[PDB]
Amino acid sequence: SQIPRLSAINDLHKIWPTVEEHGAAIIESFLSLDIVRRLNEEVDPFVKIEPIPAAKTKDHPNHVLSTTTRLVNVLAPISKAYREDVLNSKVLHRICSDAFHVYGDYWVLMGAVMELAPSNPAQPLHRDMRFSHPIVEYLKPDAPATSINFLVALSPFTAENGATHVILGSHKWQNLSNVSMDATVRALMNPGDALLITDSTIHCGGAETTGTETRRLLTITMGISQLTPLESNLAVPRPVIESLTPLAQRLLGWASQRSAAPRDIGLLTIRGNSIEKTMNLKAEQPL
Amino acid sequence: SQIPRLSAINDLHKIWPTVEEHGAAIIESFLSLDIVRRLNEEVDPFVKIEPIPAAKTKDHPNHVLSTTTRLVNVLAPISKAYREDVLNSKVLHRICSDAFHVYGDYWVLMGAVMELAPSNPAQPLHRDMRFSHPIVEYLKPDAPATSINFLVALSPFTAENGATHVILGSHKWQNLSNVSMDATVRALMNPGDALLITDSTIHCGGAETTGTETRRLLTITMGISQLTPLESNLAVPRPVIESLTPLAQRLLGWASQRSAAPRDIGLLTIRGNSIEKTMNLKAEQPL
Ligand SMILES: CN1C(=O)c2ccccc2NC(=O)/C1=C/c1ccc(C(F)(F)F)cc1
Ligand SMILES: CN1C(=O)c2ccccc2NC(=O)/C1=C/c1ccc(C(F)(F)F)cc1
Ligand SMILES: [Fe+3]
Ligand SMILES: [Fe+3]
């Protein structure tokens, strides 16, 4: 039983429901080739200057990722393609609104580009959020997913190069005795394609067996605005922020947020008023 | 059966365990009279110029609070007593650290001064966070509290003036069939005393029957860093922020946060580094 593939331009409303039922979906041509090329181009140097995850020079080192992994987050300052095309993607927003309607507003928990070097070993099967948000493990099983992850291929995902393994239907599992690599299916994708999974979906990066190929992806974790993000955009220059759309500003934490409660009082408010209104924050102002 | 009253200076380790078991506790002399006096002095103007909760001039109106209540949050820039004495209170930090060890770092969800005018009606029994964080409702019942509320009396709490009603043991309730004002006990307090309750504790503001007395309190909601705060400190002048201690900076969202996960990757980080290191934020620098 393989992962469901859906069109990003045709069968839309079918994406979230599909992931909901199966826990994983592949969205063909989520990003266009032109968009991928610009992103690749823009982040290229930052990826080459990124040290190992657990570098000693970091005060918040990542001890979970392998030494052959380079992860670059806080992409709004680095790339125009990400902060304009990606953050405003209509397909992403429709999927998110469908997924998080019961909770309310959603934002970016993390936007990052990941590069796996040649001979990168396979990760152990896991679920996202366990190393940052312990609260998630205390949610009731029928609770709707609080975060989802868009895994966009910036390069080819093949069996030989480490394409993502996924266990279909495991987002609903309560007993984890059944977890094994034998229950997984692969996510073979071309650049621009995206694998969508919920925070409860068991999966893992594959093993790179060629010794040649380098795999890159853009990982976008979207979550309800009630959860603190992994990355911060506080230090992003005002001009950049003021250059984005109000929607993008909100996803980045530069706006107040709302919940689904009928008489919602809001998040990140300032004495009854929004962050943006208090600060008279401009939007869509070019550099 | 009345609310347990504990000393803030002696029986310190008994406060959290007491609240955990009973859902509420009075902490006598949580703030000293000098601190209270300064706080009152400092926020007095902002309380008098505050409009009704659902003022039409606000973009994030509060339709739940009554029209005779004035609520003023984002207190760091207004008061030195709050931002220095209160945010650094040793009692508060020992309580929070004991409450939230399971989850990790905690911060301020909201710091607010509340004033109730004469003849303020009694609120309906309720639980906090329902109009802002719908996620809380999907937590398993054995999940440790994700937020707690310090209700500090800035004026006297009497039966006649509207002192807070609480239903002891109601934080462990799954069935809300027997919720009634008849199950409640009062929190009679002198200025500086604090009523501590969990997010699951059923309570309500009392009715002020004198027609003359005004009741004021400082409400402080402390929650795990994994939940988004209700108030934002983004627009607080940097000098002010750079004036606080590092701990206070963290409680205000002007620092990166950590969780209890063994190989924690952190929250609000910037490419492996903290907000404070990235921005080279100064601390304890007088105005
Ligand atoms: C730690 N971590 C991340 O760094 C991360 C990286 C990109 C996008 C989301 C993301 N969120 C997480 O919770 C997370 C899970 C995770 C990664 C690797 C392994 C290993 F085991 F394989 F190593 C286990 C678990
Ligand atoms: C809306 N609300 C607050 O404004 C608030 C105000 C100060 C400190 C925490 C706090 N947390 C909440 O989610 C909340 C609960 C709440 C207040 C009044 C009533 C009424 F109904 F009684 F009014 C009901 C519910
Ligand atoms: Fe993962
Ligand atoms: Fe309340």
PDB file of C-alpha atoms in Angstrom, chain A:
ATOM      1  CA  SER A   1       0.000   0.000   0.000  1.00  0.00           C
ATOM      2  CA  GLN A   2       1.693   3.167  -1.208  1.00  0.00           C
ATOM      3  CA  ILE A   3       1.521   6.800  -0.200  1.00  0.00           C
ATOM      4  CA  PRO A   4      -1.268   8.766  -1.823  1.00  0.00           C
ATOM      5  CA  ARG A   5      -0.232  11.236  -4.466  1.00  0.00           C
ATOM      6  CA  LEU A   6      -2.293  14.291  -5.059  1.00  0.00           C
ATOM      7  CA  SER A   7      -2.256  17.184  -7.435  1.00  0.00           C
ATOM      8  CA  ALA A   8      -1.625  20.545  -6.000  1.00  0.00           C
ATOM      9  CA  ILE A   9      -3.566  22.321  -8.672  1.00  0.00           C
ATOM     10  CA  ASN A  10      -6.537  20.034  -9.081  1.00  0.00           C
ATOM     11  CA  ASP A  11      -7.683  17.863  -6.193  1.00  0.00           C
ATOM     12  CA  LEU A  12      -7.097  20.252  -3.351  1.00  0.00           C
ATOM     13  CA  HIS A  13      -9.777  19.720  -0.795  1.00  0.00           C
ATOM     14  CA  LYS A  14      -8.673  16.136  -0.993  1.00  0.00           C
ATOM     15  CA  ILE A  15      -5.287  16.756   0.507  1.00  0.00           C
ATOM     16  CA  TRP A  16      -5.994  17.287   4.176  1.00  0.00           C
ATOM     17  CA  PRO A  17      -8.657  14.562   4.331  1.00  0.00           C
ATOM     18  CA  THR A  18      -6.205  12.220   2.764  1.00  0.00           C
ATOM     19  CA  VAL A  19      -3.512  12.927   5.270  1.00  0.00           C
ATOM     20  CA  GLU A  20      -6.019  12.729   8.037  1.00  0.00           C
ATOM     21  CA  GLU A  21      -7.030   9.276   7.072  1.00  0.00           C
ATOM     22  CA  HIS A  22      -3.630   7.990   6.128  1.00  0.00           C
ATOM     23  CA  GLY A  23      -1.178  10.190   7.968  1.00  0.00           C
ATOM     24  CA  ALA A  24       0.848  10.954   4.902  1.00  0.00           C
ATOM     25  CA  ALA A  25       0.420  12.330   1.459  1.00  0.00           C
ATOM     26  CA  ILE A  26       2.605  13.378  -1.391  1.00  0.00           C
ATOM     27  CA  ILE A  27       1.768  16.564  -3.131  1.00  0.00           C
ATOM     28  CA  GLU A  28       3.078  16.650  -6.653  1.00  0.00           C
ATOM     29  CA  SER A  29       4.413  19.972  -7.761  1.00  0.00           C
ATOM     30  CA  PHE A  30       3.771  21.789  -4.529  1.00  0.00           C
ATOM     31  CA  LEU A  31       6.489  24.170  -5.540  1.00  0.00           C
ATOM     32  CA  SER A  32       7.340  25.016  -9.105  1.00  0.00           C
ATOM     33  CA  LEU A  33      10.735  24.386 -10.577  1.00  0.00           C
ATOM     34  CA  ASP A  34      11.405  28.079 -10.753  1.00  0.00           C
ATOM     35  CA  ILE A  35      10.696  28.462  -7.069  1.00  0.00           C
ATOM     36  CA  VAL A  36      12.946  25.605  -6.170  1.00  0.00           C
ATOM     37  CA  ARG A  37      15.763  26.990  -8.231  1.00  0.00           C
ATOM     38  CA  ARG A  38      15.610  30.347  -6.571  1.00  0.00           C
ATOM     39  CA  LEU A  39      15.460  28.847  -3.118  1.00  0.00           C
ATOM     40  CA  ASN A  40      18.299  26.557  -3.865  1.00  0.00           C
ATOM     41  CA  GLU A  41      20.279  29.462  -5.135  1.00  0.00           C
ATOM     42  CA  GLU A  42      19.540  31.698  -2.212  1.00  0.00           C
ATOM     43  CA  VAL A  43      20.305  29.336   0.595  1.00  0.00           C
ATOM     44  CA  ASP A  44      23.272  27.616  -1.024  1.00  0.00           C
ATOM     45  CA  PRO A  45      25.934  29.584   0.829  1.00  0.00           C
ATOM     46  CA  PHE A  46      24.276  29.413   4.210  1.00  0.00           C
ATOM     47  CA  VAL A  47      24.141  25.700   3.889  1.00  0.00           C
ATOM     48  CA  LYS A  48      27.802  25.549   3.008  1.00  0.00           C
ATOM     49  CA  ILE A  49      28.777  27.649   6.014  1.00  0.00           C
ATOM     50  CA  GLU A  50      26.633  25.771   8.484  1.00  0.00           C
ATOM     51  CA  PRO A  51      28.437  23.730  11.072  1.00  0.00           C
ATOM     52  CA  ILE A  52      27.441  20.455  12.547  1.00  0.00           C
ATOM     53  CA  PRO A  53      24.221  20.373  14.496  1.00  0.00           C
ATOM     54  CA  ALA A  54      25.907  19.928  17.834  1.00  0.00           C
ATOM     55  CA  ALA A  55      28.634  22.387  17.173  1.00  0.00           C
ATOM     56  CA  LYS A  56      30.319  23.582  20.325  1.00  0.00           C
ATOM     57  CA  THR A  57      29.841  27.159  19.294  1.00  0.00           C
ATOM     58  CA  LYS A  58      26.081  26.989  19.707  1.00  0.00           C
ATOM     59  CA  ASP A  59      24.276  27.687  22.937  1.00  0.00           C
ATOM     60  CA  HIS A  60      21.332  25.605  21.756  1.00  0.00           C
ATOM     61  CA  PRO A  61      23.033  22.674  20.053  1.00  0.00           C
ATOM     62  CA  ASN A  62      21.119  19.872  18.408  1.00  0.00           C
ATOM     63  CA  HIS A  63      22.313  16.550  19.663  1.00  0.00           C
ATOM     64  CA  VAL A  64      19.838  14.490  17.755  1.00  0.00           C
ATOM     65  CA  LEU A  65      20.738  15.137  14.192  1.00  0.00           C
ATOM     66  CA  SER A  66      23.630  13.377  12.588  1.00  0.00           C
ATOM     67  CA  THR A  67      26.938  15.041  11.943  1.00  0.00           C
ATOM     68  CA  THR A  68      26.250  14.765   8.251  1.00  0.00           C
ATOM     69  CA  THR A  69      23.209  16.962   8.477  1.00  0.00           C
ATOM     70  CA  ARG A  70      23.214  20.666   7.895  1.00  0.00           C
ATOM     71  CA  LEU A  71      20.099  22.468   8.912  1.00  0.00           C
ATOM     72  CA  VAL A  72      19.405  26.088   8.298  1.00  0.00           C
ATOM     73  CA  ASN A  73      16.381  27.762   9.774  1.00  0.00           C
ATOM     74  CA  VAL A  74      15.138  31.329  10.091  1.00  0.00           C
ATOM     75  CA  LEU A  75      14.919  31.646   6.333  1.00  0.00           C
ATOM     76  CA  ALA A  76      13.012  34.886   5.960  1.00  0.00           C
ATOM     77  CA  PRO A  77      16.141  37.010   5.928  1.00  0.00           C
ATOM     78  CA  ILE A  78      18.038  34.772   3.617  1.00  0.00           C
ATOM     79  CA  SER A  79      15.589  34.125   0.858  1.00  0.00           C
ATOM     80  CA  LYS A  80      13.087  36.071  -1.165  1.00  0.00           C
ATOM     81  CA  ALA A  81      11.601  32.968  -2.644  1.00  0.00           C
ATOM     82  CA  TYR A  82      10.782  31.615   0.763  1.00  0.00           C
ATOM     83  CA  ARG A  83       9.473  34.781   2.285  1.00  0.00           C
ATOM     84  CA  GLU A  84       7.305  35.717  -0.631  1.00  0.00           C
ATOM     85  CA  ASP A  85       6.296  32.661  -2.607  1.00  0.00           C
ATOM     86  CA  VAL A  86       6.508  30.003   0.055  1.00  0.00           C
ATOM     87  CA  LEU A  87       5.051  31.792   3.020  1.00  0.00           C
ATOM     88  CA  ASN A  88       2.087  32.875   0.901  1.00  0.00           C
ATOM     89  CA  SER A  89       1.468  29.662  -0.898  1.00  0.00           C
ATOM     90  CA  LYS A  90      -2.197  29.127  -1.455  1.00  0.00           C
ATOM     91  CA  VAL A  91      -1.944  25.405  -1.207  1.00  0.00           C
ATOM     92  CA  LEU A  92      -0.195  25.553   2.105  1.00  0.00           C
ATOM     93  CA  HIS A  93      -2.723  27.923   3.515  1.00  0.00           C
ATOM     94  CA  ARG A  94      -5.701  25.944   2.399  1.00  0.00           C
ATOM     95  CA  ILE A  95      -4.268  22.809   3.823  1.00  0.00           C
ATOM     96  CA  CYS A  96      -3.485  24.510   7.115  1.00  0.00           C
ATOM     97  CA  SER A  97      -6.807  26.113   7.545  1.00  0.00           C
ATOM     98  CA  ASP A  98      -8.475  22.780   6.941  1.00  0.00           C
ATOM     99  CA  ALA A  99      -6.245  21.050   9.454  1.00  0.00           C
ATOM    100  CA  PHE A 100      -6.334  23.553  12.241  1.00  0.00           C
ATOM    101  CA  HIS A 101      -9.848  24.927  12.114  1.00  0.00           C
ATOM    102  CA  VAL A 102     -10.718  23.578  15.501  1.00  0.00           C
ATOM    103  CA  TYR A 103      -7.802  25.338  17.142  1.00  0.00           C
ATOM    104  CA  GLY A 104      -7.675  28.568  15.207  1.00  0.00           C
ATOM    105  CA  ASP A 105      -4.766  30.501  13.841  1.00  0.00           C
ATOM    106  CA  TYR A 106      -1.598  28.724  12.849  1.00  0.00           C
ATOM    107  CA  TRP A 107       1.981  29.799  12.327  1.00  0.00           C
ATOM    108  CA  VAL A 108       5.431  28.599  11.470  1.00  0.00           C
ATOM    109  CA  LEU A 109       7.055  26.455  14.057  1.00  0.00           C
ATOM    110  CA  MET A 110      10.083  26.014  11.788  1.00  0.00           C
ATOM    111  CA  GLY A 111      11.046  26.762   8.218  1.00  0.00           C
ATOM    112  CA  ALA A 112      14.308  25.154   7.338  1.00  0.00           C
ATOM    113  CA  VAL A 113      16.429  23.781   4.610  1.00  0.00           C
ATOM    114  CA  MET A 114      18.072  20.467   5.316  1.00  0.00           C
ATOM    115  CA  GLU A 115      20.983  18.963   3.455  1.00  0.00           C
ATOM    116  CA  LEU A 116      22.089  15.446   3.976  1.00  0.00           C
ATOM    117  CA  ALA A 117      25.540  14.617   2.922  1.00  0.00           C
ATOM    118  CA  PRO A 118      26.598  11.566   1.020  1.00  0.00           C
ATOM    119  CA  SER A 119      26.457   8.401   3.035  1.00  0.00           C
ATOM    120  CA  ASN A 120      23.993   9.857   5.481  1.00  0.00           C
ATOM    121  CA  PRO A 121      22.584   7.049   7.535  1.00  0.00           C
ATOM    122  CA  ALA A 122      18.973   6.424   8.099  1.00  0.00           C
ATOM    123  CA  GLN A 123      17.282   7.940  11.041  1.00  0.00           C
ATOM    124  CA  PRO A 124      15.393   5.934  13.556  1.00  0.00           C
ATOM    125  CA  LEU A 125      11.654   5.941  13.220  1.00  0.00           C
ATOM    126  CA  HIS A 126      10.223   8.759  15.283  1.00  0.00           C
ATOM    127  CA  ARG A 127       7.523  11.365  15.676  1.00  0.00           C
ATOM    128  CA  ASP A 128       8.262  15.071  15.460  1.00  0.00           C
ATOM    129  CA  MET A 129       7.999  17.466  18.402  1.00  0.00           C
ATOM    130  CA  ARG A 130       9.220  15.142  21.136  1.00  0.00           C
ATOM    131  CA  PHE A 131      12.433  17.069  21.690  1.00  0.00           C
ATOM    132  CA  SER A 132      10.898  20.468  22.017  1.00  0.00           C
ATOM    133  CA  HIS A 133       7.306  20.176  22.989  1.00  0.00           C
ATOM    134  CA  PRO A 134       6.625  17.586  25.663  1.00  0.00           C
ATOM    135  CA  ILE A 135       3.108  18.833  26.038  1.00  0.00           C
ATOM    136  CA  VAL A 136       2.171  17.080  22.817  1.00  0.00           C
ATOM    137  CA  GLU A 137       2.604  13.663  24.317  1.00  0.00           C
ATOM    138  CA  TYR A 138      -0.070  14.527  26.837  1.00  0.00           C
ATOM    139  CA  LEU A 139      -2.756  15.151  24.337  1.00  0.00           C
ATOM    140  CA  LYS A 140      -5.710  12.858  24.089  1.00  0.00           C
ATOM    141  CA  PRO A 141      -5.566  10.557  21.073  1.00  0.00           C
ATOM    142  CA  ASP A 142      -8.623  12.008  19.395  1.00  0.00           C
ATOM    143  CA  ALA A 143      -7.172  15.438  19.598  1.00  0.00           C
ATOM    144  CA  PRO A 144      -6.627  16.930  16.214  1.00  0.00           C
ATOM    145  CA  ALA A 145      -3.033  17.320  15.148  1.00  0.00           C
ATOM    146  CA  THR A 146      -1.399  20.425  16.471  1.00  0.00           C
ATOM    147  CA  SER A 147       1.329  20.597  13.880  1.00  0.00           C
ATOM    148  CA  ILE A 148       2.067  19.260  10.430  1.00  0.00           C
ATOM    149  CA  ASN A 149       5.205  19.009   8.414  1.00  0.00           C
ATOM    150  CA  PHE A 150       5.649  19.879   4.801  1.00  0.00           C
ATOM    151  CA  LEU A 151       8.706  18.104   3.478  1.00  0.00           C
ATOM    152  CA  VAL A 152       9.587  19.736   0.203  1.00  0.00           C
ATOM    153  CA  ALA A 153      12.102  18.120  -2.055  1.00  0.00           C
ATOM    154  CA  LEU A 154      14.808  20.462  -3.238  1.00  0.00           C
ATOM    155  CA  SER A 155      16.479  17.519  -4.959  1.00  0.00           C
ATOM    156  CA  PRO A 156      15.455  13.997  -6.027  1.00  0.00           C
ATOM    157  CA  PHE A 157      14.386  11.613  -3.368  1.00  0.00           C
ATOM    158  CA  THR A 158      15.263   8.147  -4.334  1.00  0.00           C
ATOM    159  CA  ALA A 159      15.525   4.811  -2.647  1.00  0.00           C
ATOM    160  CA  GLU A 160      19.256   4.865  -3.136  1.00  0.00           C
ATOM    161  CA  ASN A 161      19.750   8.349  -1.842  1.00  0.00           C
ATOM    162  CA  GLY A 162      17.691   8.247   1.314  1.00  0.00           C
ATOM    163  CA  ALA A 163      14.123   9.110   0.503  1.00  0.00           C
ATOM    164  CA  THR A 164      11.820   9.335   3.501  1.00  0.00           C
ATOM    165  CA  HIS A 165      10.255   6.213   4.976  1.00  0.00           C
ATOM    166  CA  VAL A 166       6.736   6.522   6.374  1.00  0.00           C
ATOM    167  CA  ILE A 167       4.428   4.107   8.214  1.00  0.00           C
ATOM    168  CA  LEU A 168       0.958   4.662   6.903  1.00  0.00           C
ATOM    169  CA  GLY A 169      -1.735   4.838   9.480  1.00  0.00           C
ATOM    170  CA  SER A 170       0.625   5.202  12.380  1.00  0.00           C
ATOM    171  CA  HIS A 171      -0.585   8.604  13.374  1.00  0.00           C
ATOM    172  CA  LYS A 172      -3.440   6.814  15.007  1.00  0.00           C
ATOM    173  CA  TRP A 173      -1.359   4.244  16.798  1.00  0.00           C
ATOM    174  CA  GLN A 174      -1.390   4.107  20.541  1.00  0.00           C
ATOM    175  CA  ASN A 175       0.668   0.923  20.958  1.00  0.00           C
ATOM    176  CA  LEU A 176       4.158   1.109  19.472  1.00  0.00           C
ATOM    177  CA  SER A 177       5.144  -2.536  19.535  1.00  0.00           C
ATOM    178  CA  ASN A 178       4.404  -2.779  15.825  1.00  0.00           C
ATOM    179  CA  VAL A 179       6.978  -0.217  14.806  1.00  0.00           C
ATOM    180  CA  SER A 180       9.380  -1.597  12.276  1.00  0.00           C
ATOM    181  CA  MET A 181      11.052  -0.671   9.036  1.00  0.00           C
ATOM    182  CA  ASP A 182       8.997  -3.418   7.429  1.00  0.00           C
ATOM    183  CA  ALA A 183       5.826  -1.409   7.785  1.00  0.00           C
ATOM    184  CA  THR A 184       7.207   1.547   5.871  1.00  0.00           C
ATOM    185  CA  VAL A 185       6.648   2.868   2.434  1.00  0.00           C
ATOM    186  CA  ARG A 186       8.875   5.294   0.597  1.00  0.00           C
ATOM    187  CA  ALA A 187       8.286   8.790  -0.618  1.00  0.00           C
ATOM    188  CA  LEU A 188       9.934   9.001  -4.012  1.00  0.00           C
ATOM    189  CA  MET A 189       9.726  12.539  -5.197  1.00  0.00           C
ATOM    190  CA  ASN A 190      11.024  15.001  -7.711  1.00  0.00           C
ATOM    191  CA  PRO A 191      12.136  18.529  -6.847  1.00  0.00           C
ATOM    192  CA  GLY A 192       9.175  20.636  -5.915  1.00  0.00           C
ATOM    193  CA  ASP A 193       7.194  17.697  -4.651  1.00  0.00           C
ATOM    194  CA  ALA A 194       6.214  17.657  -1.001  1.00  0.00           C
ATOM    195  CA  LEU A 195       5.559  14.948   1.524  1.00  0.00           C
ATOM    196  CA  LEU A 196       3.017  15.973   4.111  1.00  0.00           C
ATOM    197  CA  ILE A 197       2.803  14.347   7.495  1.00  0.00           C
ATOM    198  CA  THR A 198       1.238  14.986  10.860  1.00  0.00           C
ATOM    199  CA  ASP A 199       3.092  15.341  14.092  1.00  0.00           C
ATOM    200  CA  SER A 200       1.972  11.860  15.058  1.00  0.00           C
ATOM    201  CA  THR A 201       3.143  10.178  11.848  1.00  0.00           C
ATOM    202  CA  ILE A 202       5.961   7.700  12.299  1.00  0.00           C
ATOM    203  CA  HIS A 203       8.643   8.161   9.681  1.00  0.00           C
ATOM    204  CA  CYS A 204      12.356   8.534   9.185  1.00  0.00           C
ATOM    205  CA  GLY A 205      14.890   9.796   6.746  1.00  0.00           C
ATOM    206  CA  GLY A 206      16.317   7.053   4.624  1.00  0.00           C
ATOM    207  CA  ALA A 207      19.798   5.813   4.120  1.00  0.00           C
ATOM    208  CA  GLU A 208      21.932   7.268   1.364  1.00  0.00           C
ATOM    209  CA  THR A 209      23.538   4.329  -0.374  1.00  0.00           C
ATOM    210  CA  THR A 210      25.341   5.786  -3.334  1.00  0.00           C
ATOM    211  CA  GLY A 211      28.040   7.671  -1.550  1.00  0.00           C
ATOM    212  CA  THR A 212      27.646  10.397  -4.126  1.00  0.00           C
ATOM    213  CA  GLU A 213      24.317  12.084  -3.927  1.00  0.00           C
ATOM    214  CA  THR A 214      23.419  14.930  -1.692  1.00  0.00           C
ATOM    215  CA  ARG A 215      19.830  15.287  -0.647  1.00  0.00           C
ATOM    216  CA  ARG A 216      18.229  18.607   0.145  1.00  0.00           C
ATOM    217  CA  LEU A 217      14.819  19.500   1.403  1.00  0.00           C
ATOM    218  CA  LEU A 218      12.840  22.363   2.690  1.00  0.00           C
ATOM    219  CA  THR A 219      11.100  21.383   5.883  1.00  0.00           C
ATOM    220  CA  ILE A 220       8.184  23.476   6.983  1.00  0.00           C
ATOM    221  CA  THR A 221       6.458  22.727  10.241  1.00  0.00           C
ATOM    222  CA  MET A 222       3.138  24.432  10.584  1.00  0.00           C
ATOM    223  CA  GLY A 223       1.405  24.471  13.904  1.00  0.00           C
ATOM    224  CA  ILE A 224      -1.311  26.116  15.805  1.00  0.00           C
ATOM    225  CA  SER A 225      -0.505  29.551  17.083  1.00  0.00           C
ATOM    226  CA  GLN A 226      -0.908  28.353  20.605  1.00  0.00           C
ATOM    227  CA  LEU A 227       2.363  26.495  20.516  1.00  0.00           C
ATOM    228  CA  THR A 228       5.672  28.215  20.730  1.00  0.00           C
ATOM    229  CA  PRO A 229       7.804  27.893  17.649  1.00  0.00           C
ATOM    230  CA  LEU A 230      11.189  26.268  17.517  1.00  0.00           C
ATOM    231  CA  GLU A 231      12.755  29.147  15.645  1.00  0.00           C
ATOM    232  CA  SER A 232      12.536  32.813  16.385  1.00  0.00           C
ATOM    233  CA  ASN A 233      12.157  35.738  14.066  1.00  0.00           C
ATOM    234  CA  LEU A 234      12.750  38.423  16.675  1.00  0.00           C
ATOM    235  CA  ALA A 235      16.097  39.411  15.269  1.00  0.00           C
ATOM    236  CA  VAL A 236      14.874  39.741  11.704  1.00  0.00           C
ATOM    237  CA  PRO A 237      15.379  43.265  10.379  1.00  0.00           C
ATOM    238  CA  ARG A 238      12.330  45.509  10.388  1.00  0.00           C
ATOM    239  CA  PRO A 239      12.669  46.378   6.757  1.00  0.00           C
ATOM    240  CA  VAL A 240      12.429  42.740   5.835  1.00  0.00           C
ATOM    241  CA  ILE A 241       9.428  42.251   8.010  1.00  0.00           C
ATOM    242  CA  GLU A 242       7.807  45.394   6.724  1.00  0.00           C
ATOM    243  CA  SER A 243       8.391  43.979   3.266  1.00  0.00           C
ATOM    244  CA  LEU A 244       6.174  40.989   3.740  1.00  0.00           C
ATOM    245  CA  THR A 245       2.505  40.495   3.539  1.00  0.00           C
ATOM    246  CA  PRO A 246       0.430  40.731   6.665  1.00  0.00           C
ATOM    247  CA  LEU A 247      -0.170  36.988   6.407  1.00  0.00           C
ATOM    248  CA  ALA A 248       3.529  36.255   6.268  1.00  0.00           C
ATOM    249  CA  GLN A 249       4.089  38.620   9.095  1.00  0.00           C
ATOM    250  CA  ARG A 250       1.661  36.638  11.161  1.00  0.00           C
ATOM    251  CA  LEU A 251       3.259  33.322  10.369  1.00  0.00           C
ATOM    252  CA  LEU A 252       6.532  34.721  11.548  1.00  0.00           C
ATOM    253  CA  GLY A 253       5.404  35.912  14.920  1.00  0.00           C
ATOM    254  CA  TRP A 254       5.252  39.546  13.962  1.00  0.00           C
ATOM    255  CA  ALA A 255       1.541  39.807  14.567  1.00  0.00           C
ATOM    256  CA  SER A 256      -1.067  39.016  17.123  1.00  0.00           C
ATOM    257  CA  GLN A 257      -2.951  35.744  16.810  1.00  0.00           C
ATOM    258  CA  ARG A 258      -6.416  34.407  17.302  1.00  0.00           C
ATOM    259  CA  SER A 259      -7.972  31.167  18.416  1.00  0.00           C
ATOM    260  CA  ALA A 260     -11.111  29.311  17.481  1.00  0.00           C
ATOM    261  CA  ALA A 261     -12.917  30.114  20.706  1.00  0.00           C
ATOM    262  CA  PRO A 262     -16.211  31.844  20.040  1.00  0.00           C
ATOM    263  CA  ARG A 263     -15.395  34.775  22.241  1.00  0.00           C
ATOM    264  CA  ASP A 264     -11.651  34.544  21.650  1.00  0.00           C
ATOM    265  CA  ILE A 265      -9.490  37.033  23.488  1.00  0.00           C
ATOM    266  CA  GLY A 266      -6.383  36.485  21.405  1.00  0.00           C
ATOM    267  CA  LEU A 267      -2.724  35.676  21.790  1.00  0.00           C
ATOM    268  CA  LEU A 268       0.164  38.116  21.898  1.00  0.00           C
ATOM    269  CA  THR A 269      -2.008  41.101  22.390  1.00  0.00           C
ATOM    270  CA  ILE A 270      -1.150  44.415  23.897  1.00  0.00           C
ATOM    271  CA  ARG A 271      -3.814  45.828  26.146  1.00  0.00           C
ATOM    272  CA  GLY A 272      -6.618  44.957  23.771  1.00  0.00           C
ATOM    273  CA  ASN A 273      -4.774  45.824  20.614  1.00  0.00           C
ATOM    274  CA  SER A 274      -2.691  43.990  18.103  1.00  0.00           C
ATOM    275  CA  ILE A 275       1.044  43.939  17.937  1.00  0.00           C
ATOM    276  CA  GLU A 276       0.938  45.318  14.461  1.00  0.00           C
ATOM    277  CA  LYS A 277      -1.439  48.097  15.340  1.00  0.00           C
ATOM    278  CA  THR A 278       0.411  49.077  18.429  1.00  0.00           C
ATOM    279  CA  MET A 279       3.635  49.196  16.522  1.00  0.00           C
ATOM    280  CA  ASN A 280       2.173  50.654  13.337  1.00  0.00           C
ATOM    281  CA  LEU A 281       3.872  48.005  11.344  1.00  0.00           C
ATOM    282  CA  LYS A 282       3.932  48.519   7.621  1.00  0.00           C
ATOM    283  CA  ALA A 283       3.394  45.723   5.178  1.00  0.00           C
ATOM    284  CA  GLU A 284       4.346  45.078   1.577  1.00  0.00           C
ATOM    285  CA  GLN A 285       6.998  47.767   1.513  1.00  0.00           C
ATOM    286  CA  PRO A 286       9.892  46.861  -0.784  1.00  0.00           C
ATOM    287  CA  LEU A 287      13.559  47.163   0.075  1.00  0.00           C
TER     288      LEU A 287
END
